[PDB]
Write an enzyme that holds these catalytic residues in place. Structure first.
Site, PDB file in Angstrom:
ATOM      1  N   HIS A 199      57.359  36.897  48.598  1.00 57.81           N
ATOM      2  CA  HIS A 199      55.942  36.607  48.372  1.00 57.81           C
ATOM      3  C   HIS A 199      55.396  36.859  46.953  1.00 57.81           C
ATOM      4  CE1 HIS A 199      51.802  35.871  49.404  1.00 57.81           C
ATOM      5  NE2 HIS A 199      51.458  37.074  48.978  1.00 57.81           N
ATOM      6  N   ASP A 207      48.519  34.238  45.370  1.00 55.61           N
ATOM      7  CA  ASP A 207      47.931  34.498  46.696  1.00 55.61           C
ATOM      8  C   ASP A 207      46.438  34.128  46.720  1.00 55.61           C
ATOM      9  OD1 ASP A 207      48.855  36.066  49.361  1.00 55.61           O
ATOM     10  OD2 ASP A 207      46.790  36.657  48.919  1.00 55.61           O
ATOM     11  N   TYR A 248      38.816  35.789  54.175  1.00 56.30           N
ATOM     12  CA  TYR A 248      39.455  34.947  55.187  1.00 56.30           C
ATOM     13  C   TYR A 248      38.438  34.398  56.175  1.00 56.30           C
ATOM     14  CZ  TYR A 248      44.065  36.804  53.866  1.00 56.30           C
ATOM     15  OH  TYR A 248      45.194  37.166  53.176  1.00 56.30           O
TER      16      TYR A 248
HETATM   17  N1  LIG Z   1      48.580  37.150  51.707  1.00 58.35           N
HETATM   18  C1  LIG Z   1      47.809  36.346  52.443  1.00 58.35           C
HETATM   19  O1  LIG Z   1      47.774  36.419  53.668  1.00 58.35           O
HETATM   20  C2  LIG Z   1      46.856  35.339  51.775  1.00 58.35           C
HETATM   21  O2  LIG Z   1      46.881  34.061  52.445  1.00 58.35           O
HETATM   22  C3  LIG Z   1      45.929  33.194  51.966  1.00 58.35           C
HETATM   23  C4  LIG Z   1      45.449  33.289  50.666  1.00 58.35           C
HETATM   24  C5  LIG Z   1      44.478  32.400  50.210  1.00 58.35           C
HETATM   25  C6  LIG Z   1      43.983  31.398  51.040  1.00 58.35           C
HETATM   26  C7  LIG Z   1      44.474  31.292  52.335  1.00 58.35           C
HETATM   27  C8  LIG Z   1      45.443  32.183  52.790  1.00 58.35           C
HETATM   28  N1  LIG Z   2      50.955  40.279  50.951  1.00 55.77           N
HETATM   29  C1  LIG Z   2      51.370  39.592  52.012  1.00 55.77           C
HETATM   30  O1  LIG Z   2      50.622  39.143  52.881  1.00 55.77           O
HETATM   31  C2  LIG Z   2      52.869  39.346  52.105  1.00 55.77           C
HETATM   32  O2  LIG Z   2      53.336  40.510  51.408  1.00 55.77           O
HETATM   33  C3  LIG Z   2      54.692  40.468  51.257  1.00 55.77           C
HETATM   34  C4  LIG Z   2      55.483  39.760  52.165  1.00 55.77           C
HETATM   35  C5  LIG Z   2      56.865  39.726  51.993  1.00 55.77           C
HETATM   36  C6  LIG Z   2      57.454  40.407  50.930  1.00 55.77           C
HETATM   37  C7  LIG Z   2      56.663  41.118  50.030  1.00 55.77           C
HETATM   38  C8  LIG Z   2      55.282  41.155  50.197  1.00 55.77           C
END
Ligand SMILES: NC(=O)COc1ccccc1
Ligand SMILES: NC(=O)COc1ccccc1
Ligand SMILES: NC(=O)COc1ccccc1
Length: 287
Positions: free
Chosen positions: A267, A97, A203
């Site tokens: 995710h 992430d 962000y």
């Molecule tokens: N879990 C999230 O929403 C993270 O999404 C990003 C993470 C890094 C760079 C851009 C988007």
């Molecule tokens: N951390 C995020 O933005 C997405 O988080 C999850 C999204 C779907 C399943 C589990 C975690």
């Protein structure tokens, strides 16, 4: 398992540590923290000094004020200084992430600091920008990033006992059976101790919102267009955040890559399917 602070790049960062030897450094993303790596820490801490960092702004780590404190160059420098500060010149870097957004950028810039990279769902600097430009599903998937620019977001995340964050990561994890009651408490404590403001600041520095910024080749500025260290991707196909096409053509940018796709993980495969993930990691680390 040890929990402590390290002072780097003008901040005190909290991290958890277990084991000794070569450094295996884990970087979480949003809205997680070091705890998400618990199963890899337990798995590898007899073979590595496993360290999971809480990124600045998160959990018990310092929460500097201002958006400038959360710019990519600063976050990359945090990582460089953490590696050196722990007494290493290189490490095995394991990322997810936001930690992958940072970790990839770090690896491209400092391939001498990274022996091997293991990357979970998250943006590769080159392929992500391509997908934002052309993949309608990715564009729809990433719409929340525009929303996150807005001051109103924090209240949605925090109100009613962190309802927004609970819905985001707690309810799916409890329902699917990969979060224990102590895991849930650990997350709730991380959000009380951390700063959602600081988490959102990451962000609010993203340059993906103007037609000119969208034109750029990489999510964050990079002179290097190829990363040649051994890399493993471990990817949950059901991730609503990042579409599977982010992996398309990735070999052009990462010639020595291996990819493992979990058909029914979402995710965060590292804690969704820790045993499957851990074996893929063993295999990669040994080849
Ligand atoms: N879990 C999230 O929403 C993270 O999404 C990003 C993470 C890094 C760079 C851009 C988007
Ligand atoms: N951390 C995020 O933005 C997405 O988080 C999850 C999204 C779907 C399943 C589990 C975690
Ligand atoms: N549709 C486009 O060209 C841009 O799409 C997005 C760009 C940034 C964040 C979310 C969506």
């Amino acid at each position: 398992m040890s929990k402590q602070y390290i002072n780097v790049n003008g901040v005190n960062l909290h991290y958890i540590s277990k084991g000794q030897g070569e450094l295996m450094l884990f970087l979480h993303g949003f809205p997680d923290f070091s705890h998400i790596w618990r199963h890899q820490i337990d798995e590898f801490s007899n073979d590595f000094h496993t360290v999971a960092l809480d990124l600045r702004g998160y959990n018990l780590s310092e929460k500097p004020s201002g958006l400038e404190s959360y710019e990519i160059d600063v976050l990359v420098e945090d990582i460089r200084q953490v590696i050196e500060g722990l007494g290493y010149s290189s490490c095995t870097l394991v990322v997810h992430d936001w930690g992958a957004g940072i970790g990839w950028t770090f690896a491209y810039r400092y391939p001498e600091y990274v022996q091997k990279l293991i990357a979970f769902n998250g943006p590769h600097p080159y392929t992500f920008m391509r997908e934002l430009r052309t993949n309608k599903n990715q564009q729809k998937a990433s719409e929340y990033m525009k929303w996150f620019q807005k001051q109103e977001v924090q209240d949605y995340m925090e109100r009613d006992n962190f309802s927004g964050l609970r819905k985001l990561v707690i309810d799916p994890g409890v329902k699917k059976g990969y979060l224990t009651a102590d895991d849930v408490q650990a997350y709730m404590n991380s959000w009380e101790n951390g700063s959602v403001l600081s988490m959102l600041s990451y962000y609010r520095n993203l340059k993906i919102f103007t037609e000119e910024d969208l034109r750029r080749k990489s999510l964050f500025p990079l002179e290097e267009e190829v990363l040649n260290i051994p890399v493993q991707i471990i990817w949950g196909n059901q991730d609503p955040t990042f579409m599977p096409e982010n992996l398309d053509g990735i070999e052009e940018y990462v010639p020595n890559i291996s990819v493992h796709r979990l058909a029914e993980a979402s995710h965060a495969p590292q804690h969704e399917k820790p045993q499957e993930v851990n074996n893929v990691m063993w295999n990669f680390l040994n080849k």
